[PDB]
Design a protein around this nucleic acid. Structure first.
Ligand SMILES: [Li+]
Ligand SMILES: [Li+]
Length: 1214
RNA sequence: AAUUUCUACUAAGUGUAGAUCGCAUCCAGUAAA
DNA sequence: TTTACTGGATGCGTAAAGGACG
DNA sequence: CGTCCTTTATT
């Protein structure tokens, strides 16, 4: 009935549910005494180490192959790639050449000796050990001798490199789809930029870069592409382009540099080269880790015995002996930091800059000018290229008897004596006996002591920095500077310790590092079938509503095998899980095996049928041969007790099958069963007691005795895994994983709200201002003791029955929906997101800013202003890094806001049966704080597309439409980013042009170019207006224009408009910088100022008779501001109004401000409400196109709306 | 201010609301020194 | 160059045949 | 030799 209601059971998707795993009984004590976790922790380190030994080998295997390959048909592939206009005759020949080009690379890899064993036991057991001749490395690899199955996943990732298919991970894809296309993109640039390369510059690269073995142009001929297959060959190629630095440190320039040097001197911009991407698997001061490290670093590098302290004591004597040195040879550097130096010596900041000019202007400002603005330019610029100031310059700035050299003596000594007074405050940090009472990151007292010391040492060091003077100065007193640079070069050492210590202290206090657990089983917990419990040694039990992960110790794999009790009232239940995974592989695997092919001797017609594939589609398809295959599989599935007894199959008549998939679907749909059997709880609780079984409660907060709310979505999915009403819509999958996450914090260090004291409640709208609990409330409690993590994959909609193209179906239903609502969703600098809901006639139903998320609980209203939370933490990091507190991450507060938004969007979708209109985002994000509005917006898009793959209403009965078992599927599988464009199910991606700056009542937009350009052009502007008069009845100036008399106005439909000088507008300065104009007085005052009388009717001739260009410049400034319909200010939160210069059919101008006040406005309330509304209306337009098309042509209807159709639409639907 | 985890919370108290696809790998990148 | 952090793209999400084995 | 690790099958 609703449009949504069609989109259930459309496609399969997979999700992972995460749970805490809580040990029960003596599990953890037995796990501890057997040192099982310690073994796994190390295995994790060895595993990452052994994979880097494998990649060392895989890289060597890749290289020798790719160094010894000559790809055939290179020239032909390039010739067809390099066609102006490509016809279908070689389009299909070229892509065959491109497919064949990759197969050539793949077939090289498989040909090599070792391709068989690269991803099998042998690579671990003998091949890799032979490759490494170090005995330590062979020891490390051989500790996986019983375990190579643990590498199965890693091996699959490495097979992806040797695929011939067109996927990012494939090596053949990196060479053919990526590196070759830029190699040829470079080819066509090089023969178009070749001229601009000097004789020697080409031979410069020849000798410095190319070995003198190859010519530069060789790398732009097709047949040398083979050189560039390897990383070594890519590193040479990219140097020809970007250059490289000699080890001496002087720079050799690449062709891209020569291009840019030429691009600057010739006024035009040449194209630049793309560099190649790296080849797959090429392997083309680090921070303190522990608290003790940081502390002994701090102690031994800043104490009075260290060299840094000697360097300060040495620099101190230098400044005390400042007058045994040449004042003409000591130089203080020139930066913006100088003004700090100026006030230290003279008592104010700009003595030094003021006295530089008084002497500078003295002969170099001419007497004429005295103070022309000419001089500001270059007296401000001649100041900043002066590189230093001698102490003899500074003293000429001084009057008797201020001696600059004794002031600097006193400033540094007052500065060295402060470092020494902070060392007293900190001396207890330097003791040998000193023991840290608390961890450093939570110890705010001890870090405050370091920062005071590292700050005072830094104040002094950055002060001393000024006295270097960047010289490279003609007569430095190298008596002074000799010792100075020594002391300063050591004093510079604090800049690494300062940053290294600060980075440790501001790391997040907790960690999420965790390692995989195997319980001494290389295929641990791989599946759930009853047959393999003993092989995988893991299974699921339950005691009523509570579920357990039960793990068999390696010594007792059968310890759960024969247990039963007759009543469950005192007992567990063990899962009975049976899965036949993937008939397409499993049925041939079994029935053609060496074990059974004899048993059901397949007709030689079947074996011939199966080898040649007459049962699959294409050239060799034969319908009766597929039915004859199914009957063999059908008959063999019976007489296979393991399948026939577990699943009672009920297939369709074989004649009714159209393709083999029709059969496999029925096998896959029915080849899954879950049930529970009884298990004596006494005879299992003792297995745990004895250490022969380990049991963990599968747990999140929803399983607590004190839990009463609506459950987490994922607890619902988990629970439904075993509900009788789950008829296959959610399957429990194999491939679970158990992890151990060591604690990262201690309870005694955690931030606490202690029991019985009142805690403030943070929502001011609730008159219960306080909460007082009888137990402690800890921050990050979950990270303060060890935690087991269980990750359980589930399969949703594994057998979809409602198969159709989602986009097509959405269009069909939209064509035949009498009243389809649309949700327009706008991105605003002003508002993170704005939302307008319209019905099928464009009537505004809802409009509001999603800046504040408003939530419902038990009569409580809470509004959470996510907008000001977001900016608070955005600058907090930049500002509060100085505070030296822990790193704030803003990515999780945006994700938090996004999840609040996504819930709100789906509630609107369901309430109004509504499609979504989204705004295309500008690729370039302009200053400043650009991901603040595009980060929330791009993340909102990914997150929303996700939820709409399986959209569940936790309140529905699970089996109701929209329930957890019958979730809505209104976006296509999020396989890629761009495979969808313009529409994805209920989501339409529509461009933003003229959605904001348009009159919603009329569709009027500004197509006029009103920047003042010349004196002459302003009178062609005024004469292209049909009339310009004063309407005394309205105190308005009317401008009758026909857009056809102005350039670039094709898109407009109405053409003829009458503009008025109605209302106020807002102006901005170019050098409060904004001021606010009222139009009718500016036109009146300007006409009075220049002797024009407005009341003299058609005044176009009158305006052009003016001779002063100031009138034209200030008149077009008004014809720019009258046309500016959107008014708001850089940073201005306050005013966002939209006002129009045009009247509507009923003779009324439009203010958003007329609508911002009322509760239920039929028009937008501000420029952001307007933008959302028009993004919605543009989708309405597309629905209109659907309604004019015929169902069979809906798929080809273009919904990307042009500026011409938009304006026609917006101007005619009123 | 608690969590499988994230965000915002704390109405009679070990929690509430919404969100949450994991693991492994490859590859593009942006910020800092 | 190095460190960190974030963006998309690939694979797996398996029972059973096959084999070694001390 | 029955236990345990490895390798297989591909809509
Ligand atoms: Li809840
Ligand atoms: Li708090």
């Amino acid at each position: 009935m609703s449009k949504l209601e069609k989109f259930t059971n459309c496609y399969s998707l997979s999700k992972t549910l995460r749970f805490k795993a809580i040990p029960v009984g003596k599990t953890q004590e037995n796990i501890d005494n057997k040192r099982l976790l310690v073994e796994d922790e190390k295995r994790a380190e060895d595993y990452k180490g052994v994979k880097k030994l494998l990649d060392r080998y895989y890289l060597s295997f890749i290289n020798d192959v790719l160094h010894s390959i000559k790809l055939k048909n290179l020239n032909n592939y390039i010739s067809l790639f390099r066609k102006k206009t490509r016809t279908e005759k070689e389009n299909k020949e070229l892509e065959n050449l491109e497919i064949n080009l990759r197969k050539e690379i793949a077939k090289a890899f498989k040909g090599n000796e070792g391709y068989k064993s690269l991803f099998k036991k042998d690579i671990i057991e003998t091949i890799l050990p032979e490759f490494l001749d170090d005995k330590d490395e062979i020891a490390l690899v051989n500790s996986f001798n019983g375990f190579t199955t643990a590498f199965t996943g890693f091996f699959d990732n490495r097979e992806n490199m040797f695929s011939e298919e067109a996927k990012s991970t494939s090596i053949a894809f990196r060479c053919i789809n990526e590196n070759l296309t830029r190699y040829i993109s470079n080819m066509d640039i090089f023969e178009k930029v070749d001229a601009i390369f000097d004789k020697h510059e080409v031979q410069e690269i020849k000798e410095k870069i190319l070995n003198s073995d190859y010519d530069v142009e060789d790398f732009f001929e097709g047949e040398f592409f083979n050189f560039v297959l390897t990383q070594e060959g890519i590193d040479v190629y990219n140097a020809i382009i970007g250059g490289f630095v000699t080890e001496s440190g002087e720079k050799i320039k690449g062709l891209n540099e020569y291009i840019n040097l030429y691009n600057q001197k010739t006024k035009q911009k040449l194209p630049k080269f793309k560099p190649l991407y790296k080849q797959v698997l090429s392997d083309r001061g680090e921070g303190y880790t522990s608290d003790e490290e940081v502390l002994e670093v701090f102690r031994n590098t800043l104490n009075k015995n260290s060299e840094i302290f000697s360097s300060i004591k040495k620099l101190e004597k230098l400044f005390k002996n400042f007058d045994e040195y040449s004042s003409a040879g000591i130089f203080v550097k020139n930066g913006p930091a100088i003004s700090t130096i100026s006030k230290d010596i003279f008592g104010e900041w700009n003595v030094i800059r003021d006295k530089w000019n008084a002497e500078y202007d003295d002969i170099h400002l001419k007497k004429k000018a005295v103070v022309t603005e000419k001089y500001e330019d270059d007296r401000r610029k001649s100041f900043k290229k002066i590189g230093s100031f001698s102490l003899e310059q500074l003293q000429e700035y001084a009057d008797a008897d201020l001696s600059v050299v004794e002031k600097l003596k006193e400033i540094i000594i007052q500065k060295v004596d402060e470092i020494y007074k902070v060392y007293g405050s900190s001396e207890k940090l330097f003791d040998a006996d000193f023991v840290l009472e608390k961890s450093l990151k939570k110890n705010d007292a001890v870090v405050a002591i370091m920062k005071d010391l590292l700050d005072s040492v830094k104040s002094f060091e950055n002060y001393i920095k000024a006295f270097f003077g960047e010289g490279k100065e003609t007569n430095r007193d190298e008596s002074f500077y000799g010792d100075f640079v020594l002391a300063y070069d050591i004093l510079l050492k604090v800049d690494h310790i300062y940053d290294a210590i600060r980075n440790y202290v501001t790391q997040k206090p907790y960690s999420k590092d965790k390692f995989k657990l195997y319980f001494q089983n290389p295929q641990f917990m791989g599946g759930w079938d009853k047959d393999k419990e003993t092989d995988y040694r893991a299974t699921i039990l339950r005691y009523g509503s509570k579920y357990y992960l039960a793990i068999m110790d390696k010594k007792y794999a059968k310890c759960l095998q024969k247990i039963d009790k007759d009543d469950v009232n005192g007992n567990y239940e063990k899962i009975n899980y049976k899965l036949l995974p993937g008939p397409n592989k499993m049925l041939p695997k079994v029935f053609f095996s060496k074990k059974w092919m004899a048993y059901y001797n397949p007709s030689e017609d079947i074996q011939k049928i199966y080898k040649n594939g007459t049962f699959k589609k294409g050239d060799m398809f034969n319908l009766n041969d597929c039915h004859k295959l199914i009957d063999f599989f059908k008959d063999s599935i019976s007489r296979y007790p393991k399948w026939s007894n577990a699943y009672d199959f009920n297939f369709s008549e074989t004649e009714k099958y159209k393709d083999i998939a029709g059969f496999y679907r029925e096998v896959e749909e029915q080849g899954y069963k879950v049930s529970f059997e009884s298990a004596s709880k006494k005879e299992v609780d003792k297995l745990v007691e004895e250490g022969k079984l380990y049991m963990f409660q599968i747990y999140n907060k929803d399983f607590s005795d004190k839990s009463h709310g609506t459950p987490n979505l994922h607890t619902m999915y988990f629970k439904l895994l075993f509900d009788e009403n789950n008829h296959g819509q959610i399957r429990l999958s194999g491939g679970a994983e158990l992890f151990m996450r060591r604690a990262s914090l201690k309870k005694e260090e955690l931030v606490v709200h202690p029991a019985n004291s009142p805690i403030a409640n943070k929502n001011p709208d609730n008159p219960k201002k306080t909460t007082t609990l009888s137990y402690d409330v800890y921050k990050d409690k979950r990270f303060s003791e060890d935690q087991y993590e269980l990750h359980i994959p589930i399969a949703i909609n594994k057998c979809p029955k409602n198969i159709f193209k989602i986009n097509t179906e959405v269009r069909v239903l939209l064509k035949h929906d009498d009243n389809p609502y649309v949700i327009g969703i706008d991105r605003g600098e002003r508002n993170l997101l704005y939302i307008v809901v319209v019905d099928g006639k464009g009537n505004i139903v809802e409009q509001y800013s999603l800046n504040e998320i408003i939530n419902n609980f038990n009569g409580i209203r809470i509004k959470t202003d996510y907008h000001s939370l977001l900016d608070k933490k955005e600058k907090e990091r930049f500002e509060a890094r100085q505070n030296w507190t822990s790193i704030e991450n803003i990515k999780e507060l945006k994700a938090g806001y996004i999840s609040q938004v996504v819930h709100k969007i789906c509630e609107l979708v369901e309430k109004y049966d509504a499609v979504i209109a989204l705004e295309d985002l500008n690729s370039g994000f302009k200053n400043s704080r650009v991901k603040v509005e595009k980060q929330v917006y791009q993340k909102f898009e990914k997150m929303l597309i996700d939820k709409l793959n399986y959209m569940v209403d936790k309140k529905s009965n699970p089996c109701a439409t929209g329930g957890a078992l019958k979730g809505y599927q209104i976006t296509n599988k999020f396989e890629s980013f761009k495979s969808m464009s313009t529409q994805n199910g209920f989501i339409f991606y529509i461009p933003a042009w003229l959605t904001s700056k348009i009159d919603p009542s009329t569709g009027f937009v500004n197509l006029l170019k009103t920047k003042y350009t010349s004196i002459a052009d302003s009178k062609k502007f005024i004469s292209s207006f049909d009339r310009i008069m004063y309407v005394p009845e309205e105190d308005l100036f009317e401008f009758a224009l026909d857009y056809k008399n102005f350039s670039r106005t094709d898109a407009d439909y109405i053409k003829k408009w009458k503009l008025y000088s109605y209302g106020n507008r807002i102006r901005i300065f170019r050098n409060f910088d904004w001021e606010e104009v009222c139009l009718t007085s500016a036109y009146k005052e300007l006409f009075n100022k220049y002797g024009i009388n407005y009341q003299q009717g058609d005044i176009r001739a009158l305006l052009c008779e003016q001779s002063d260009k100031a009138f034209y410049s200030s008149f077009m400034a008004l014809m720019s501001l009258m046309l500016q319909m959107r008014n708001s200010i850089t940073g201005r939160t306050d005013v966002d109004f939209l006002i129009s210069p045009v009247k509507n059919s009923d003779g009324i101008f439009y203010d958003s401000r007329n609508y911002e006040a009322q509760e239920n406005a039929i028009l937008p309330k501000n420029a952001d409400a307007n933008g959302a509304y028009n993004i919605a209306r543009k989708v309405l337009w597309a629905i209109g196109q659907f309604k004019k098309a015929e169902d069979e042509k809906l798929d080809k209807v273009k919904i990307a709306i042009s500026n011409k159709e938009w304006l026609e639409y917006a101007q005619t639907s009123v």
